[PDB]
Amino acid sequence: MRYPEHADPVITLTAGPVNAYPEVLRGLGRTVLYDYDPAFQLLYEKVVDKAQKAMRLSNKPVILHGEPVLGLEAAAASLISPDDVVLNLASGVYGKGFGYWAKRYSPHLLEIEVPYNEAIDPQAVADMLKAHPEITVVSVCHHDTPSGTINPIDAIGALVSAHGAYLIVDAVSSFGGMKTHPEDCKADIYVTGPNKCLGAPPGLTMMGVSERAWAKMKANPLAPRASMLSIVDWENAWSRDKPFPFTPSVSEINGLDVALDLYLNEGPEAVWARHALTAKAMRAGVTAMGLSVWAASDSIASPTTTAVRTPDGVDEKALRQAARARYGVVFSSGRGETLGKLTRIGHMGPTAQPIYAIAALTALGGAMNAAGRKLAIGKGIEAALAVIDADA
Amino acid sequence: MRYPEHADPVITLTAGPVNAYPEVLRGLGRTVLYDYDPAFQLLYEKVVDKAQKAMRLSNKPVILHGEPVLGLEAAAASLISPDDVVLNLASGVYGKGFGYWAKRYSPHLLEIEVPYNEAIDPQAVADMLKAHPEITVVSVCHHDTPSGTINPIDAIGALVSAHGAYLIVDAVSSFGGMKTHPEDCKADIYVTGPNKCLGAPPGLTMMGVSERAWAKMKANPLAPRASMLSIVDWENAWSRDKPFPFTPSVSEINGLDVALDLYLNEGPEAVWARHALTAKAMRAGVTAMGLSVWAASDSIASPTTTAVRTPDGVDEKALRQAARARYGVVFSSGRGETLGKLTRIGHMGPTAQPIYAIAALTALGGAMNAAGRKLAIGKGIEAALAVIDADA
Amino acid sequence: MRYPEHADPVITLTAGPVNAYPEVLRGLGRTVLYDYDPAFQLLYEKVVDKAQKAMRLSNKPVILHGEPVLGLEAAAASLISPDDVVLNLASGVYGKGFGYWAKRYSPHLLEIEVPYNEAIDPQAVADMLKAHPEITVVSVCHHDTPSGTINPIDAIGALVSAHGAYLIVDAVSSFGGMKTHPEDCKADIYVTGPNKCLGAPPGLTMMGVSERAWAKMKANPLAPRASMLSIVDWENAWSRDKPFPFTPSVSEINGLDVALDLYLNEGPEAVWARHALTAKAMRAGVTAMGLSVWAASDSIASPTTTAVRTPDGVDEKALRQAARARYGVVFSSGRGETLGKLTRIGHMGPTAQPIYAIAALTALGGAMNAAGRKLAIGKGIEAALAVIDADA
Amino acid sequence: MRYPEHADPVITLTAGPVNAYPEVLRGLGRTVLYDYDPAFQLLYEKVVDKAQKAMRLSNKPVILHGEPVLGLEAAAASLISPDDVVLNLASGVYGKGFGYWAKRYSPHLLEIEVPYNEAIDPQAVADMLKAHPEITVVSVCHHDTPSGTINPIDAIGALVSAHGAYLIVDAVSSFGGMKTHPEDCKADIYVTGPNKCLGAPPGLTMMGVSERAWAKMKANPLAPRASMLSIVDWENAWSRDKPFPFTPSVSEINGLDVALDLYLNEGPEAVWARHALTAKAMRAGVTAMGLSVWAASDSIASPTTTAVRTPDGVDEKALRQAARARYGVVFSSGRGETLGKLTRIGHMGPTAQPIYAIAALTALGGAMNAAGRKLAIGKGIEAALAVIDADA
């Protein structure tokens, strides 16, 4: 049998979007209230509170009404002034991408770049900060999703703070899937969203903003105001007694409310543990069947996405097409420089369950063997199962 | 009895958000596909196709992934450059507000302004264009929602086309509720969304873009690129064979898909008819009970919102609070310069049914009489019912 | 304009089914678990607990997996033995109907019957019990829905208990809409369901069973066992550690779980108050516009349904057809003997809000006037509004 | 990690209930119409029409408003009278169970019984009918779910028709998952429902009734009338111009409407193919890892459920508990005489996709090996995958 391209798949095991939690799907269908209805004003405030709790934040996170690219662009536009000296850290497509936004707002850009299967060395950051005491802003990506690798943002954040500089963190594809919070890495702007590990669709940004970041932005006359890019205009919008700069995405708020409930109710530590275990099983299976994990070392592989290096001679696009057509299972391609070079299996929110690693490994192996590889699929499944069983 | 502020209301009869069509609420809970899944790529293309059909467009409308303030800001930022001389037409909050964005992108701003219960006079537009050959861009709001009034955008658009200028039209709260289309008014940029008459929640922008506008925006070094504010980045994203500049709001697209099906299946003309009838009945009831329609004339009153002038001396905020607390019915305040001057009752999508005008009249009259007015509520209901019963 | 018969209506204001609460609609879409999954076994037990709390029951209510006709037939089949002497009380279609089931299970049937707009006199019950000391079972209907009238079941229950007889109560269309509980009327079998005032669809029965009723049924070898009609087989099915006699209606259980939450969370007393107020406003409006409430006295009119007598010369079916076609509002016909003689407007769960009485009165008046009546519709609305305002 | 019993599982792979199709879950949340609303009357008629098309029926199927045990009990109660001599065919729990209801309605019962891993032999049926001209009714179960085995009902039905007897067929867990229709087996009563292969929750019965069966039931003084158990009461209820004996399960009808659309739109043959492939892959994997399929032969194994024999010495209850606790995968126990003897993995509707066989095999193998077995799980997965990859 074959699954047609036009028809829905059986299991979406991508690095996001994945299907939302079923409760979130129902939540998206909640009553759409007028945004100035008192019941909505209360709800919105409560949602900010839940987000604050989930992010372990000492102050209120800002919700912005676009998917997280909005938060990242807004952070650059607001926190980077023309006299700032920015150090951008690039270990993949998103990290490198951010430097282009930094250069938009300040002509002074320094960069540390590593190969797109490696991680930034905190010591290299320290060496750079010593060489360049003029640095005032540092930007880093936690999980550079198209690479499935993780940067040590807490160690990096400690060094940025030691140098009196501001830290911008992209944690879009890590928050909620592993231990990470604005406080942990001493972030001044910490950008995430509910559309990766939290199991909601794309549409909203969740942003931690330090009191020092608030001061800097509010004193910056170039920071966007009366603009979709404005962070400062949303400063007090959490309050039931305050207006919204523009109309909030009411249904997305309903979805986020449920996503936060699910996360908080399950227990963040338990949620992180199942992401890590699913990924660990996946990597063990990949290696056992004769494939290679993309990450330069196991230690930097993401607990929320496994990137698998495309073997020589294998057409990666055809591979994904075959996994879907044969088994109904959808994986992600790479992006930019990693496009065509790897395949990504997400382990995110609803898909962060070890049984999904088993399904993924089988479909990946099956498609690889259809492409003429001679993988030991059974061996891969047993290796993955051994990881699950050893944690039991 | 009293309805608590924290509890949900019984009927939301605002000028938006209103509760979405029940089908749309269910639609929002459809499968969230990976955005590069072939089934989603096809779905997105077919949603753009539906929007093109709904908008009677000769070319593809652009969907932007924020609520229509994004469309309006992006249009200013992309189409208006400092060489342009902008004529902004202002008869209300949104019309005047657009001038602020125009001035951000060009120092040259001329305006025709009328009080916020009037419509722009096409003779004044013709005269202004004649006196100012230097005008290159003209902006106008179709339904300036906080006033419940309509501008004659088709005649205005023809004058603008004859002059040789670009036209930017805000049809956020008119499209889908009355006859209007980019073609009808020779729009170069026509901004709307599904969150007023189309009965979806806030989150997306539907934008008609003329071939001439495309060329102007793509030529302009100052037009946003690699930005939330970019229209040009999204030119080819409708196509199943093309990537997305950033991740689309997948669940909002599911909602839009349903909203467009409802509209096209019902028949746009039939849909416009019931908006207009609901509004006509509303206005008749308002006048018969002893209140005044805000619009300077009945002829410019919107078929998608009835704005009712607050009797001098009545506390409009307390009035709305009373309507919700006594009867569970939610109305909109004014906004900006109409705040405190009037109350708005929306007739939009799911609320554009004449029986809702009856409910609105009773709650409005009841709240007014609680504030010491002596309205003839029965007379109001009978006048509204006569309109319904007379409809041919 | 006209609403086609094939298309959905705007507002369903019948005596049930009405549209479910929106939360219940979402709840019906919850995960369908295996009935022997431990999470479902726990859920089912919790649902019984919630039902017990809502019914103010000293012991567990039984949920049966058919709409309440099942409970009523099962009660007759189980509690009525061939040597029982049954007194059936009939003030309408359902009360009279029950006597046919009683006669199925015992040849000994006595009856008190009153006209179908009147109520049973507790004194007549007392007189009958004195005349016939051999009576062992008495059956009564609380709200005989096709009549929109209420029997004094607590007073009647006290007299039945005084005579040592068992009491079967049909509270299908009263429970949750007014103060009534098995304990209040000393019921031995108390049959209701969530498909009237509780705002869920039809499918489930909620049955209070006294310990004395349990003893009687279990000792009755003719009581249905291994049967859809079995109550006794479900005795222990509430327990997470016990099996289900047959497969429960899992999705209906999900709906009931939400319905109970809504009721308990709002506060039963507050729920009853809004049913009573909506009905009170409705009756005041009916009378003021020149129509007649069917009930012989206002005191016996149901707080959950208003039955309106059809004027001479008016085609009641055509009337309902016109209310729907003209205004999109759906009312109930009568049933059996009341069919063609009255129209019913329900005030049940989601429709038990006074603003719906206003909509109902307008559509009823409008349709009556279309039929050549000359009703004072405005006067009716004002009378209804006066009732609402006097409770404020 | 461990999945708590109180928390939801990851994948329900039981022989039903399984989670409903996502479209059905949404369908259950459709508007609940008044049952006498013309739009519902039409909808109900069109749902019966869809069921008739799905069942390839020459006449209208009857929908009864309880899960299919209602259909089976009602069929016994209506079709079997004490003059009848019933031949009950028993190869499992449901087959044997039906004999109990037969005996309730006629004292004359003959039976052909085989052990609960076998199928009824059509030669034995022919011989029995020959030896017993007095047989007037024959009952058979198509898929006796607690055994995962299939009886040859088409050949059996032809023998029964030749004999001149009525045939009652239980196709609850076969219809929609393999080729079978009332016509195919000359059924006089054919009982099924949407809660197994059709991917809806429990609550409705779909019943094929022959013209001959109608005449027999309507003649029988003992057939239930004015009863939950009545088939005869429902004969004309499909028609938009006819009343309902009691209130239909409106939300279940919405669910059924969607389930039938899914089935008819996909193509019944295509649907049967994927059930059969999923099952075939499952059986291959079970055997290759070292376990035994319960069915006496592969040829009688159901394409909608794989029953796996418990290795002697293994605690089957603890096994299922382990599969859920370790892997979040839910399997069915046996029932009655198969309880403790085997574990069942359903392949039904939404779970009838081959990738689910892979997940089931891994969780089953993992749980078995945790109980001290030494299964070749990798080998099992590879054998299952080979079946998938071989499918022409």
Ligand SMILES: Cc1ncc(CO)c(CN)c1O
């Ligand atoms: C690492 C990362 N950053 C930012 C974004 C923008 O939302 C994405 C989404 N691909 C992402 O994966």
Ligand SMILES: Cc1ncc(CO)c(CN)c1O
């Ligand atoms: C006329 C108008 N324009 C733009 C917007 C921004 O979405 C709104 C919404 N108030 C509006 O009513």
Ligand SMILES: Cc1ncc(CO)c(CN)c1O
């Ligand atoms: C009073 C009454 N009793 C019993 C039933 C059976 O559910 C109904 C539903 N019409 C009813 O209204």
Ligand SMILES: Cc1ncc(CO)c(CN)c1O
């Ligand atoms: C074969 C069979 N018959 C009847 C029923 C009653 O619905 C079931 C459900 N276990 C079944 O599996």
